């Protein structure tokens, strides 16, 4: 009955755990997306972007996946490519955390390292350059704009939250990288299940481009340490229309918070999980949110961050 034909189908069904040392009388609950193949929420879009591209005919046997990503999406696409028998090339600055170069190499990824001083843009340039060499051979999935990103969250992540809270969820707090998570979850709960919850996007105070944009202020991205969020631009897969509130969190507090999750709750989450919880804790301690059930996405697990600043 419940046997997955390959690892890409085993995505999701991640659990909700109530926090004891955050929030007020258990109003803060976390969704542990570290409980996923490849250990992050991105396993969901890794799978669905491939599935959709197959259904569309844009991805077929023989064709190669090419994309730029220096985060969890590369690991997600790698495991999906391996599971379903696609060749994959990932471009990323030559400033990767070796372990990730090995993890990816171990997954069969053709690593193309670009110059670091170029950063992501360097890498995306090389990706598109490689796609240009034979557009018939290479397909780029484009996580920041590919609608299959938020769609998978609308079909799985959102419905899991609804079901596990028995529709009692009042607030969703999620860090924004591509925006896919908050977008899909919000669409699911507000539009499909019809409940007017509060959707809270989280971003680094160091690079608060969503806050600046919505305020009509000058957009000034900046460097930060909250891996997975703060892209420094507004991605196409962030639907600003469903965002009710934006909370900013600083890198040190995000880090301190992730450490508290481990030491105090026995929850092994990544830096961005600490950021999401710090924002949620702030809301949870406002009297306006006292009798509200707040669900916080924890995007990844902490062992992906041994030798960062977390440990």
């Amino acid at each position: 009955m419940a046997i997955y034909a390959d690892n890409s189908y085993s995505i999701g069904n991640t659990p909700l755990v109530r926090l004891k040392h955050f929030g007020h009388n258990g109003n803060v609950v976390v969704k542990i997306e570290g409980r996923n193949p490849s250990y992050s929420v991105k396993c969901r879009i890794g799978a669905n972007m491939v599935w959709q591209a197959e259904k569309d005919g844009t991805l077929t046997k023989g064709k190669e996946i090419v994309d730029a990503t220096s985060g969890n999406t590369g690991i997600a696409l790698a495991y999906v490519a391996a599971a379903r028998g696609y060749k994959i090339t990932l471009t990323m600055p030559e400033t990767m955390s070796l372990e990730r170069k090995r993890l990816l190499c171990g997954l069969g990824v053709n690593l193309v390292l670009t110059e670091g001083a170029k950063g992501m843009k360097g890498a995306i340039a090389k990706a598109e350059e490689i796609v240009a060499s034979d557009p018939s051979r290479y397909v780029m999935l484009k996580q920041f704009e590919n609608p299959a990103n938020p769609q998978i969250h609308r079909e799985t992540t959102g419905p899991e939250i609804w079901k596990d809270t028995d529709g009692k969820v009042d607030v969703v707090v999620a860090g924004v990288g591509t925006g896919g998570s908050i977008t899909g979850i919000s669409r699911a709960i507000k539009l499909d299940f019809g409940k007017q919850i509060t959707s809270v996007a989280v971003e680094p105070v160091e690079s608060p481009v969503i806050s600046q944009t919505l305020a009509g202020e000058e957009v000034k991205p900046g460097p930060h340490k909250i891996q997975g969020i703060g892209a420094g631009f507004i991605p196409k897969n962030l639907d600003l229309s469903i965002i009710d509130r934006v909370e900013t969190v600083d890198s040190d507090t995000a880090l301190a918070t992730a450490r508290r999750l481990m030491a105090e709750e026995g929850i092994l989450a990544g830096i961005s999980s600490g950021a999401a919880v710090a924002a949620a804790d702030r809301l949870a301690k406002l009297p306006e949110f006292a009798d509200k059930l707040i669900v916080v996405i924890l995007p990844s697990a902490s062992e992906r961050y041994l030798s960062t600043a977390l440990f």
Binding site: S70, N72, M120, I124, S207, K225, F233
Partner: peptide
Amino acid sequence: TFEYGDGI
């Protein structure tokens, strides 16, 4: 640090 889509 992370800038312009880096680390995602």
